[PDB]
């Protein structure tokens, strides 16, 4: 049955103010959405449940941890919308084992970093969604210019909002040159 948290068709469960992931979404529903969520933290493993997702939605939530492999276990994913929450850390096997991911969104969860390899294994991505966080361009985000410049996906023009003097520059427009790391 659905759980009280959520409003529940055959295909589709939209749940508001979750304490914690529930662990009794019916297990046959295919898209599944969290906005203003109390939870804090995505562990490993959170969505074992509803082993046929195709499309996940977190707005609108505060996280503490995207844990590495918070979304393994879920071979039919295709759609992950992860946008406008507050997210202190995501991890980098975070999107471990979504080798069928078509389009990913972070957008607008002002983001100061992304770690190294996060899209690593992601292979039939076609859209990566990057737009309105807040990168800083130091070393530690020098992959990902890397990866803008080799990936087939369609990314949106980023930019840095920091240090001071990146601020507003085009992160796709940049190169390894301007990163002399150690």
Request: charged residues 20%; hydrophobic residues 35%; aromatic residues 10%.
């Amino acid at each position: 049955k659905c759980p009280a948290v959520c409003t529940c068709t055959k295909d589709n469960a939209l749940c508001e103010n979750a304490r914690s992931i529930p662990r009794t979404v019916p297990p046959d529903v295919i898209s599944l959405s969290f906005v203003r969520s109390g939870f804090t933290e995505i562990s490993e493993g959170s969505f074992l449940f509803t082993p046929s997702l195709q499309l996940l939605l977190f707005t609108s939530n505060s996280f503490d941890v995207i844990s590495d492999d918070a979304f393994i276990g879920l071979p039919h994913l295709e759609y992950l919308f992860i946008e406008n929450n507050n997210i202190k850390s995501i991890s980098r096997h975070t999107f471990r084992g979504l080798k069928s991911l078509i389009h990913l969104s972070l957008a607008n969860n002002n983001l100061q970093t992304l770690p190294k390899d996060i899209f690593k294994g992601l292979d039939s991505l076609t859209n990566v969604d990057l737009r309105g966080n807040s990168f800083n361009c130091d070393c530690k985000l020098k992959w990902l210019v890397e990866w803008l410049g080799h990936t087939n996906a369609t990314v949106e023009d980023i930019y840095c909002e920091g240090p001071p003097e990146y601020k507003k520059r085009k992160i796709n427009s940049l190169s390894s040159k301007d990163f002399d790391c150690i």
